[PDB]
């Protein structure tokens, strides 16, 4: 049987309900003195400033009176992926490429900042109608090359990108995916036949 169980939402439709914590579970009478000895703190429907927002709009919360005016705690999560910013001069000097238009590079970087370097999302959102068609490897190559060049110009070191290896990897994956059911069945049949051959060889070696 299973040693431990793993699931995201819940393991099965037959799952027992979660146990919620609560007082008074053993009856109200036994906890009468405990509940009666104290009084609840006041809660308010109050506006709160979120410093992560740049506009300054005020939304409303259910919070204790003492918490009024405190900094919003979820604003600590607000941090974007570091992406360099370059001037027209810096691009003309270092980032110029006959294969890439400047407006195209700016669009790529805008998408990169919008989608936190999720290059698959950048490829899906890439404006193939206005600019030239680009593969995700081309976008990654351009981004990493520009980042390396800007770092070397300004200032540490970063690993270089290998577009060719990624292209070969995707090509191999696509070839492995497009194969017919017969070809994959043949691959598994060869795997099992090789395993049985090796097993017989190992048995003969063990006998010797």
């Amino acid at each position: 049987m299973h040693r431990e169980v793993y699931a995201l939402l819940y393991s099965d439709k037959k799952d027992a309900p979660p146990l919620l914590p609560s007082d008074t579970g053993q009856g109200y009478r036994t906890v009468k003195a405990k509940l009666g000895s104290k009084k609840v703190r006041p809660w308010k429907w109050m506006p709160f400033t979120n410093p992560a927002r740049k506009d300054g709009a005020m939304f409303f919360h259910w919070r204790r009176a003492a918490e009024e005016g405190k900094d919003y705690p979820f604003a600590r999560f607000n941090k974007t992926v570091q992406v360099p910013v370059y001037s027209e001069q810096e691009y003309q000097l270092y980032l110029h490429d006959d294969a890439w238009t400047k407006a195209e590079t700016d669009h790529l970087f805008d998408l990169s900042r919008r989608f936190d370097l999720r290059f698959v999302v950048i490829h899906d959102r890439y404006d193939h109608q206005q600019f030239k068609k680009r593969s995700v490897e081309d976008l990654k190559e351009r981004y990493y090359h520009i980042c390396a060049k800007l770092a070397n110009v300004r200032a540490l070191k970063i690993p270089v990108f290998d577009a060719g290896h990624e292209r070969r990897r995707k090509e191999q994956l696509e070839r492995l995916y497009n194969r017919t059911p017969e070809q994959v069945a043949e691959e598994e049949y060869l795997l099992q036949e090789l395993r049985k051959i090796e097993a017989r060889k190992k048995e003969r070696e063990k006998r010797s």
Binding site: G36, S37, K38, K39, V40, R41
Partner: peptide, 20 residues
């Protein structure tokens, strides 16, 4: 009864013994 002589204390505050 205790409530007739003493204030209940707010949660998170140390009891001190304030009367009505």
């Amino acid at each position: 009864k205790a409530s007739r002589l003493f204030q209940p204390v707010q949660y998170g505050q140390k009891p001190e013994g304030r009367t009505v």
